Amino acid sequence: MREIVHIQAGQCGNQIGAKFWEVISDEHGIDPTGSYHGDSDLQLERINVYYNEATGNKYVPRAILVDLEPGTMDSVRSGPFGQIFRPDNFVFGQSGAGNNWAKGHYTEGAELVDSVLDVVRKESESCDCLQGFQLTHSLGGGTGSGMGTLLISKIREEYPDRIMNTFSVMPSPKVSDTVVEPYNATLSVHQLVENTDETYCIDNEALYDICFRTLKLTTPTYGDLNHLVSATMSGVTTCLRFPGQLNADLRKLAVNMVPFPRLHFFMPGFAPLTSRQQYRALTVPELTQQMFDSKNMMAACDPRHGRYLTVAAIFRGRMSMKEVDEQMLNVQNKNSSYFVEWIPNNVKTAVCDIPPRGLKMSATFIGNSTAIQELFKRISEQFTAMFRRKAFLHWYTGEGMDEMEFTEAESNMNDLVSEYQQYQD
Template sequence: MSSSLLILLPFPPYTTYFTLFPSIFLCQPKQNLSNSLSFSTMREILHVQGGQCGNQIGSKFWEVICGEHGVDLTGRYNADGESSDNHLERINVYYNESSGGRYVPRAVLMDLEPGTMDSIRSGPYGQIFRPDNFVFGQSGAGNNWAKGHYTEGAELIDAVLDVVRKEAESCDCLQGFQVCHSLGGGTGSGMGTLLISKIREEYPDRMMMTFSVFPSPKVSDTVVEPYNATLSVHQLVENADECMVLDNEALYDICFRTLKLTTPSFGDLNHLISGTMSGVTCCLRFPGQLNSDLRKLAVNLIPFPRLHFFMVGFAPLTSRGSQQYISLTVPELTQQMWDAKNMMCAADPRHGRYLTASAMFRGKMSTKEVDEQMINVQNKNSSYFVEWIPNNVKSSVCDIPPKNLRMASTFVGNSTSIQEMFRRVSEQFTAMFRRKAFLHWYTGEGMDEMEFTEAESNMNDLVAEYQQYQDAAVDDEGEYDEDVDGVEEDYES
């Protein structure tokens, strides 16, 4: 009976039919077609920056992105004689177009004191941000993780989440979040990790990528850095998908050694970081031959869920004086991006092995040449790659190079040598925690010693995990039985 009823039903009106089967009706002029389908290419990223360090890195990043997309200091598009199609096609990844034709960054800026916010507002790009998206307190976190996570930060977090929600609702298809913060202070570490855990609760299926500035081995700004960093890593292991690990000392070294700057400023350091940040997402924003995005990056780089702390690098990095003597070629970029001196964190990849790596190239180049170079690197340095993950280097090629460069590349590597950083911080943490030094500042904000003990053991577990996979060999699990071994020996002979 029901089947005959179905046959007798009339066709729905055309409007309804279009909503059910839009592809049948898509024979229309080309420009309308691209407009009607533009929603499918929008993969927005919501940017959050917290604390003094995070806000300074973040504001430098927006300078770079504005330059790449031709957005001027007022948020207007300024073609500058270049192809507008490439600039505007996917500008929505990082920008929201307002009714007045201005491009407004999808950015949330937070801090527990007004100082950094004021300097961003009064800076050259201060006018492009939505005024409502500046969320700040007055008291500061005083380099105390507990203040950022449990007291001062907890009072401000709802206001920040409201702005995050508003921005997320204005997206067509939010791909994920990127957070800039440091782990040594109070706001970026304490309130930053609080925000990450709240966002994770509310948007569990969106990607969470962080650019985290770790305490430097020799240069210390704050005595309690090891406490703040260990408590932060405890949170990042559980709540972040991808952590790009940076530190000031490695960045200073790049400025001194490679760029030959005699007195590098934080601005120079932040410029290095922003080049990497834009490189990681360039495939989402510009057309390319081999695309990559936050989720593809995670799927290809994270063999085990807790091991998501990456080393990053960028090429070309050359001093002003030697730029004219260097030819920008794919082999040249490849050689520099894999160079240990080029890594932006204080861990030496030669002391460990790569579980996985990703190379994101930008500019006009042949994918065949890129593939050949990647295979070449793996063959020549096979001892530095774990043999039980074959073909563990992912590459992508984006056609549009960064501003003022013919080609460039961004490197992201998951190396077991990153444990050097965790081990160093853990040793400093243990030395102070054994004597309960400075602990009263944290317990005074309501924290319990137990939380310190848990964070310490989580960090030590992480180091042990990296070491375990560094030492692992193909046949550790005993997958092969004797017969198979015999066959293999015959084959080799």
């Protein structure tokens, strides 16, 4: 009974979080009303990881929905699986955060944060043995970014020895709402460097390119982007949701994936990514080749520009475990220059028999690569292009922030980039 408490904050956080629960509920046989209708015992074996069991054999997601405006959470409550969530676990305000990190972190967010912690505390108190937390949010907005990292800080204060995990959506000019997103993301990244154990970097720049170039979607929508995020979140949590030996829990994953405390930002990847030739059987060699392909990466960084510190791979579906080991060893032995040679046997592989919906077999990639510095460099350059002219700062100083806090965040992220660079050489 290793329970995880899930939190989703802001527009992005709640829309991706909704799709995540929709996907895994289907995989575990839970219908929109919380009733189980599966046909395999593997579905319920580890169900309590993400679901509470209520009267009448009902399974209720251990999820807390947070926002500073009601709109998105109204949509969730009226969505496909909206009725499966605990009505008490909707915590929202009315003011909004105005795409402003300061509003989420210091003013509007500060007024609502205690009521969220009350719900978090309620869910944790009923856990047999709480593993830790997972937060879904964007870094480019105000609520998920500012209030999300505020929540992480207050959760760590109350649960200092629990694991904090996040799925963090990084902003990109190609899929942007406002010009201040580099500000909100730089402020948030520093919080994550200090207060999270594992962060899955989900780059909207990569999600767009995959949709446009690989899936041939002429005009990608946020819904198209979130289909990739749902599939990825399901893949990376498979080790937690089904019987297995590798990782299997948040702390063990962290111990195998994070050799240095600040370098806990992961490049996720998924295969196949097929456009509508969609019925063709996919071989283990193809699954393995694509899973390591940069075009299958959702961080928008080229792995061949850095080195892998650690890699976790998860194969799903009925396949040849012997062939899985062969192709994996083939990739490592054929490109051993992109794997640091001072962490022996740093590529681990796991297999799960239950494939995702509508696929015979798939592969999910989790990489701790020094190439992720390209992502932080990109944000840092966009931050500096505006900050050198103090552009748009009045939105933040109007909420009580000083310019010095921006300079410190700017320096903290450039420090992070420098740390990745030393282990790359």
